[PDB]
Amino acid sequence: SEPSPYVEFDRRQWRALRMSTPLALTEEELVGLRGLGEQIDLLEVEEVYLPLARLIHLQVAARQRLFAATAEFLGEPQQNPDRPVPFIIGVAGSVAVGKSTTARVLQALLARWDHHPRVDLVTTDGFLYPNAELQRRNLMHRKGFPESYNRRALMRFVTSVKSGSDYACAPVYSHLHYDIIPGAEQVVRHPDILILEGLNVLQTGPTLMVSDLFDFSLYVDARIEDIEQWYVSRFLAMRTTAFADPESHFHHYAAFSDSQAVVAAREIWRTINRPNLVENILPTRPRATLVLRKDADHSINRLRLRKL
Amino acid sequence: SEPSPYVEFDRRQWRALRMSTPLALTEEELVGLRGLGEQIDLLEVEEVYLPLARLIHLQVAARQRLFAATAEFLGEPQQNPDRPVPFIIGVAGSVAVGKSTTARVLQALLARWDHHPRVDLVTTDGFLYPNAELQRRNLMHRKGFPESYNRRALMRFVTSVKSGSDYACAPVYSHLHYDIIPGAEQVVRHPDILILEGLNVLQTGPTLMVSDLFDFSLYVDARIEDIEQWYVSRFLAMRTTAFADPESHFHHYAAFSDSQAVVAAREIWRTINRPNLVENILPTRPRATLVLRKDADHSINRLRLRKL
Ligand SMILES: CC(C)(COP(=O)(O)OP(=O)(O)OC[C@H]1O[C@@H](n2cnc3c(N)ncnc32)[C@H](O)[C@@H]1OP(=O)(O)O)[C@@H](O)C(=O)NCCC(=O)NCCSSCCO
């Protein structure tokens, strides 16, 4: 036998940990959060996301006590009871694994908490370098990799917010144009909770990084072959959604046949997304507070929690 | 202007943070902790180590609330009020920087806390591979480097203790024989606080490591040229202490002249200790909760605290 920092759960065990947590989300609101391909329904929100929201609100008060201790030690004032220390959450995972929806659902739940906390959600792609700058660094084929984001700027952003700033700015990325939007900004004003979602978020290193500022993090996981399947399938579905727009950077993909589309999508997975997942994303899975394991049908039926 | 995760202090500012913290250490007890070359006196213990001990005891209660939240969420019992969750402390730094004394002094202070906590101290060299095994891996010239320790065993040890085990074993290293002592063990029995001191301790990576289990850590820092100076000087002093013992693995060093000794000590610093410090130890300085900066005279007159 051997001791471990983690505790594994199946949905039956984890759903019981919901207790009385109310369900403040309608089936229609879920739709507004549901991403293309995603199978998440209100049942999963009850048996999986509600226990998560509970665990997170238990730790928010606790986390603040810790920051209180340091404040006390330093002989500082105290804390405007209504302008606390932002609880930062990191959501990571591979492209097409569902992390985007997971973060949006988590934000909706936490925000509808009795004390109605101001909960902001920022995706890291707003921190991607503009295509022209990526071109400069010869990184257009490495878009999504750690070095494709302005990690300095990202770290400055999260640091500014958790340090108690009145406001902090983040650039905005346009998936439609496949590039940063000139002049656009997302202003975050001292939220009570900040969710940061991106491929890169849990990465660690020789310098203090955004992951070192997280008070809680989740990794959305799945069999790599399944994620590729979801990616390719989402790619074919996009021919009639995003790619169908004449303004789309990838509008030429709309006319691909099922066959040509699979070939193109598989190649991008093989040369860009798979390498990034295997080399940079997966290695960060061990440090996540909670790992959500999804089955081939996108169903979350297993979880791994870090008690230590 | 720019926000930061750290707050810098000079001794004048930091010593004021002592408040009423009692001094339960005699000048003679300090001697029993003082390492060869070290200049630490009771004044430094009051202006620097006492504020540290205070800050640590404020965070111990706070840290436990956090583990309490998770226990509550999981619907577990509660916690024998007298067999809690061990607060783990990491102490890192270069060879000859004084980290060994710093850890021993910290242990003495914390243990003499009103509620008399059971405080254990474990140095990582007990986890060094035996010379014969180092020979096997061709690492005898890399002794001290991360790959020279059994990190798997070390992680198992710290994990076992923080997980609440009744007892955990650690091998024992003999500096006199420059090797692991066959059959020797240090038994740690559910301490309230465990201090882990070693060159490697704050290292991070692709797997969950000992640093991920620390609730607080300190890095003992200094100008690299000063540390080399301290190393060489300690080396010459050892000719009449440790090396003077016929049983010493390095007994041949006792007969070196000042000149030959400096040459030998400088070469080891250049080929082993300096490379390790620069490549593996220093890069971990950013993640330490508290950095103790020492001047050429070993004096600690600056500190960097991680509030975030
Ligand atoms: C741009 C980048 C780095 C963005 O990374 P993300 O972490 O946002 O990827 P993720 O899979 O989480 O996508 C997030 C959302 O972004 C959507 N999206 C991604 N690419 C596009 C797109 N080109 N047009 C419209 N929507 C898109 C995707 O459908 C998600 O929507 P939902 O919120 O409704 O679920 C990534 O998509 C990428 O391009 N990686 C490497 C290069 C690559 O894959 N190129 C192929 C481009 S055409 S395939 C578009 C669907 O993947």
Ligand SMILES: CC(C)(COP(=O)(O)OP(=O)(O)OC[C@H]1O[C@@H](n2cnc3c(N)ncnc32)[C@H](O)[C@@H]1OP(=O)(O)O)[C@@H](O)C(=O)NCCC(=O)NCCSSCCO
């Ligand atoms: C074995 C190892 C990895 C141990 O690392 P540590 O983190 O314990 O080094 P650190 O500088 O903290 O030494 C801790 C104590 O260990 C003592 N010590 C180190 N080497 C020896 C020794 N050979 N004989 C007796 N005492 C020794 C040192 O004087 C400290 O005593 P205090 O508690 O009184 O301060 C390291 O000393 C080493 O050998 N590194 C690379 C190879 C090397 O430097 N070889 C030269 C050996 S002769 S020089 C002995 C003094 O450095």
